[PDB]
């Protein structure tokens, strides 16, 4: 069997950080995100019988074994669930700008989930692809559905999955991603999550998440941008508060990250609707009603230290091609 599927990365408005079950990637808290249309992972899966072990190609090159044992531990699940014991060649490509440091894990395991199961013949519901993608990478659950997506955290493998709050066309929001020239090579998120429990502030952050989710959920449905803007900045600061207070601390911010966060908040307070959020890295995502993207991109491009500004709009669900 053979299939090919594409998925978008997503930007979390309410952050996933910390695991209730690290293996199954059942999160301590729920999260909400928007798919990013202009960036894509395309992955083809080819099951061939009696090939010894699994094979992984990434952007044309033989993936490193860390990458391969991730995908083949993943494909083990697609086997345990299909009965079928075939190994497979995985070929994946993405169009992510060169060294901008943009996280691919979500888009990649969303695509891997859709192509692998379709290639091995199955026909999973959207809810079930997301339960599957989740086990490859937490935030991958959220790239399976489209548009604005909520991840229902749950306490079991069956209860933890994501669903579309709203389709992409429901709210014309843009993400202007400030890529920082100077960029470091940060601790990967899987370790970061594990260290969240060393933070004295993680329990309080986690317990407060339903308050934050309800405000953002309502804001997306009602298209209430100022409520969205203040909450995503607060949620992003809460996650980084936890990161910065872990042992050892995780300081993903670069000095220019600080400049951008302060500038975005000043821009919004003086009239330009905009808001910042950061993942486990120094790039700064600026969310704005798309009618303001030009202005936001202009102001971001003038900030010393900003290498370039990517422009992404609300993207759709993972799809077979």
Ligand X SMILES: C[C@@](O)(CCOP(=O)(O)OP(=O)(O)O)CC(=O)O
Which residues contact ligand X by CB under 6 A? 12, 15-17, 25, 31, 103, 105-106, 137-139, 189-190, 193, 279-280
138: partner contacted, choices ligand X, its own copies, none (Cβ within 5-8 A by kind): ligand X
Least Å distance, CB 174 to ligand X, is 18
Rounded to whole angstroms, how far apart are CA atoms 294 and 272? 11
Among 259, 289, 308, 311, binds its own copies (CB under 8 A): 259
Label residues 52-62 b or e (16+ Cβ within 10 Å = b).
eebbbbbeeee
Burial class (CB in 10 A: 0-12, 13-18, 19+), 257: buried
Three-class SS of residue 139?
A: helix
DSSP secondary structure string, 213-275?
A: HHHHHHHHHHT-HHHHHHHHHHHHHHHHHHHHTSSS------HHHHHHHHHHHHHHHTT---E
Closest distance to ligand X from the beta carbon of 195 (Å): 12
CB 263 → ligand X: shortest distance, Å? Answer: 22
- Spatial separation of the C-alpha atoms in residues 209 and 180, rounded to whole Å: 29
> Is residue 122 at the binding interface for its own copies, with CB under 8 A as the rule?
no
Residue 227: contacted member of its own copies, ligand X, none (CB under 5 to 8 Å, by partner type) = none
Nearest to 57 by CA among 94, 10, 96: 94
| 28 touches its own copies by CB under 8 A | no
Q: Pick one of its own copies, ligand X, none as the site partner of residue 51 (Cβ within 5 to 8 A by kind).
A: none
From the list 22, 221, 258, 321, which residue makes contact with its own copies (rule: CB under 8 A)? 258
C-alpha–C-alpha distance, residues 200 and 205, integer Å: 10
The yes or no reply on residue 255 touching its own copies (CB under 8 A) is yes
* Smallest separation, CB 252 to ligand X (Å): 8
Q: Interface residues with its own copies (CB under 8 A)?
A: 200-201, 203-205, 208, 230, 233-234, 237-238, 240-242, 244-245, 247, 249, 251, 253-256, 258-259, 261-262, 265
């Amino acid at each position: 069997g053979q299939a090919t599927a594409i998925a978008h990365p997503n930007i979390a408005f309410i952050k996933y950080w910390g695991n209730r079950d690290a293996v199954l990637r059942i999160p301590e808290n729920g999260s909400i995100s928007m798919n990013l249309a202009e960036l894509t992972v395309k992955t083809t899966v080819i099951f061939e019988k009696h090939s010894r072990e699994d094979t992984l190609i990434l952007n044309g090159a033989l993936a490193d074994e860390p990458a391969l044992k991730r995908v083949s531990h993943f494909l083990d699940r697609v086997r345990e669930f299909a009965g079928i014991s075939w190994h497979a060649h995985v070929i994946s490509e993405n169009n992510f700008p060169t060294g901008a440091g943009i996280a691919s894990s979500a888009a990649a395991f969303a695509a891997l989930a859709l192509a692998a199961t379709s290639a091995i013949g199955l026909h999973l519901s959207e809810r079930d692809l997301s339960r599957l993608a989740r086990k490859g990478s937490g935030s991958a659950c959220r790239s399976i559905p489209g548009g604005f997506v909520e991840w229902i955290p749950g306490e079991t493998d069956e209860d933890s999955y994501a669903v579309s709050i709203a389709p992409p066309e429901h709210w014309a929001l843009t993400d202007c991603i400030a890529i920082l020239s100077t960029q470091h090579k940060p601790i990967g998120s899987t370790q970061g999550h594990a260290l969240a429990s060393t933070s004295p502030l993680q329990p309080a952050r986690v317990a407060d998440t339903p308050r934050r989710l309800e405000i953002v959920r309502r804001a997306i449905l009602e298209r209430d941008f100022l409520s969205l803007a203040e909450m995503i900045e607060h949620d992003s600061n809460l996650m980084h508060a936890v990161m910065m207070t872990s042992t050892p601390p995780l300081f993903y911010w670069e000095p220019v990250s600080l400049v951008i966060m302060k500038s975005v908040r000043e821009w919004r307070e003086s009239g330009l609707p905009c808001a910042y959020t950061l993942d486990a890295g120094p790039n700064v995502h600026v969310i704005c009603p798309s009618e303001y993207a030009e202005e936001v991109i202009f102001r971001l491009t003038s900030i010393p230290g900003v290498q370039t500004v990517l422009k992404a709009s609300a993207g759709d669900s993972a799809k077979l091609i």
